[PDB]
Tab-separated table of C-alpha atoms in Angstrom:
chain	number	residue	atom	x	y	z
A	1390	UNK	CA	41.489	64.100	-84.872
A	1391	UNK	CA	44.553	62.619	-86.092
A	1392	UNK	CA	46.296	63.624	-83.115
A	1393	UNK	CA	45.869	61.131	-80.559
A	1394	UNK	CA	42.521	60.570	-79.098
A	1395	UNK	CA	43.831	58.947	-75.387
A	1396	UNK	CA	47.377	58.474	-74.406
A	1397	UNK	CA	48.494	60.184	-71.139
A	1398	UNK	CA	46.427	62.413	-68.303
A	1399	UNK	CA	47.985	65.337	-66.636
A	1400	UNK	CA	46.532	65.902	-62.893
A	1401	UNK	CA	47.011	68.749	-61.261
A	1402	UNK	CA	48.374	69.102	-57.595
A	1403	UNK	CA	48.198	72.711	-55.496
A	1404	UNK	CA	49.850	72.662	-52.656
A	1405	UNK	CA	49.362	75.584	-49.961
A	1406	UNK	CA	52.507	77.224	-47.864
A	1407	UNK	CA	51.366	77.174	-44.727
A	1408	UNK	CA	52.843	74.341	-42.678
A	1409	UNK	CA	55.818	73.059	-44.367
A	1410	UNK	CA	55.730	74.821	-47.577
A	1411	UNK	CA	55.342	72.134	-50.296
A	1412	UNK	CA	56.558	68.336	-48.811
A	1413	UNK	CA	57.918	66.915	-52.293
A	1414	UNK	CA	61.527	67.222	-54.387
A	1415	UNK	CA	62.564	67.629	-57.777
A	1416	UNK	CA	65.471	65.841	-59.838
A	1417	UNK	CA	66.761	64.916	-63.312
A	1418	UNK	CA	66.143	68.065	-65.586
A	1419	UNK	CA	70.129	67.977	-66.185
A	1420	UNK	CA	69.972	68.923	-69.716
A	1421	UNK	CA	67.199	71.349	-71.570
A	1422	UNK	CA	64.470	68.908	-71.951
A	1423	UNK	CA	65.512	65.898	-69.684
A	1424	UNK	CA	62.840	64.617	-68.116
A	1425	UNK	CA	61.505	65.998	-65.013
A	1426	UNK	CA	60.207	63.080	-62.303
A	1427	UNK	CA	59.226	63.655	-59.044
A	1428	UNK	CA	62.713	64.247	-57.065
A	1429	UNK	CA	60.857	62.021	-53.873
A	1430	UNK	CA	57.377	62.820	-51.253
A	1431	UNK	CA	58.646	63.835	-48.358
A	1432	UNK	CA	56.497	60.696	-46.243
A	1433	UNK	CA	53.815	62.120	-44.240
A	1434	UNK	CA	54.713	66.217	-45.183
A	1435	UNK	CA	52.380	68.240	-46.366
A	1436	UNK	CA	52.321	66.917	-50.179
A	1437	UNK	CA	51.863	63.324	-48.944
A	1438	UNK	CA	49.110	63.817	-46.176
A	1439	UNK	CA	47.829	66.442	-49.584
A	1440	UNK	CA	47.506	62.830	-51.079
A	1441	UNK	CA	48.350	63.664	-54.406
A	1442	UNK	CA	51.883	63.195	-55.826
A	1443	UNK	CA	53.889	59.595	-55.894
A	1444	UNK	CA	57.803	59.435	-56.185
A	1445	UNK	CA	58.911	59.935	-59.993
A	1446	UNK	CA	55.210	61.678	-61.509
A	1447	UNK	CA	56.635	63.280	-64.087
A	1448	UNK	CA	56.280	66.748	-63.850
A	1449	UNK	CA	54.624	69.264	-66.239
A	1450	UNK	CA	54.350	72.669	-64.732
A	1451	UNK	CA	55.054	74.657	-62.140
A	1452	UNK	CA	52.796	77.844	-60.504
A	1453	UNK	CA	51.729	78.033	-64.407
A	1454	UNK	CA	55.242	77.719	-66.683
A	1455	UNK	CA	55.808	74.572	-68.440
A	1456	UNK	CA	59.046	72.941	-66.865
A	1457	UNK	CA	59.657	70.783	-70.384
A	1458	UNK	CA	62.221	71.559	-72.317
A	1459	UNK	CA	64.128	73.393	-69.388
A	1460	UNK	CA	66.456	72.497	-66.604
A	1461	UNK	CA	66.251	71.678	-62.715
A	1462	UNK	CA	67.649	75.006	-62.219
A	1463	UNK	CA	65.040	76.299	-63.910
A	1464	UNK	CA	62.069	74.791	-61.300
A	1465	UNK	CA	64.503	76.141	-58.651
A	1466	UNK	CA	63.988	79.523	-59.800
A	1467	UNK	CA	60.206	78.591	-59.902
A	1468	UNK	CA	59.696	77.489	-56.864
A	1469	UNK	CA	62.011	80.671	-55.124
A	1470	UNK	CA	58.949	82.474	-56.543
A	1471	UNK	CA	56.002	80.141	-55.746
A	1472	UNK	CA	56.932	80.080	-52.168
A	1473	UNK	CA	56.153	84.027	-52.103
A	1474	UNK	CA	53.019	83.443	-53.599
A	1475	UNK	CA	52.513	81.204	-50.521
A	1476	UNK	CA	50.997	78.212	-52.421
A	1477	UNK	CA	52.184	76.162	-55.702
A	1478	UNK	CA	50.533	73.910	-58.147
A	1479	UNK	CA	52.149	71.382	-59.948
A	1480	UNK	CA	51.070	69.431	-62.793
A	1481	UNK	CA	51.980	66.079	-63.032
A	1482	UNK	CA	51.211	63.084	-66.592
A	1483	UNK	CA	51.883	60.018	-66.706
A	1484	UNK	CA	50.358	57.864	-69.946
A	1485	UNK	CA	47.040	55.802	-69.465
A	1486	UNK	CA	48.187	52.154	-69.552
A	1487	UNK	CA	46.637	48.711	-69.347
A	1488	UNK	CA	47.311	45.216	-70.341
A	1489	UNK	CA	47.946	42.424	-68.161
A	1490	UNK	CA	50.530	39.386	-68.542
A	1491	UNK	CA	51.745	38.358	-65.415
A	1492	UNK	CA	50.499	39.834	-61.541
């Protein structure tokens, strides 16, 4: 304990290279520890019909290294090995929220 009971989830997201080989992007990264959202789905490839990732999850890692604190380039270099090991998985967080005022 006082370290933060509940605050954000990571879920997890494989993806297999078999058909496409891995239907989402990657942006921001641009300096060592920018943050690193969900480039864009590609709509209806095979992350989206996966039915698992949404445009700008924040990413946390990548076939097993932690992106944070890195670059893009350095996901580039990740996935230019991932797609040899014919499948990915990408962990994605984004914090717990609720609390209504207007809908």
């Amino acid at each position: 304990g006082s370290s933060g009971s509940s605050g954000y989830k990571e879920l997890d997201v494989h993806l297999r290279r078999m058909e496409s080989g891995f239907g989402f992007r990657i942006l921001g990264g641009d300096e060592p520890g920018q943050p690193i959202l969900i480039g864009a789905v590609i709509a209806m490839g095979s992350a989206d019909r996966d039915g698992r990732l949404h445009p700008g999850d924040e990413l946390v890692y990548v076939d097993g290294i932690p992106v944070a604190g890195k670059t893009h380039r350095y996901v580039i270099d990740l996935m230019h090995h991932a797609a040899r090991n014919g499948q990915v998985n990408l962990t994605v967080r984004r914090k717990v929220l609720s609390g209504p005022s207007s809908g």
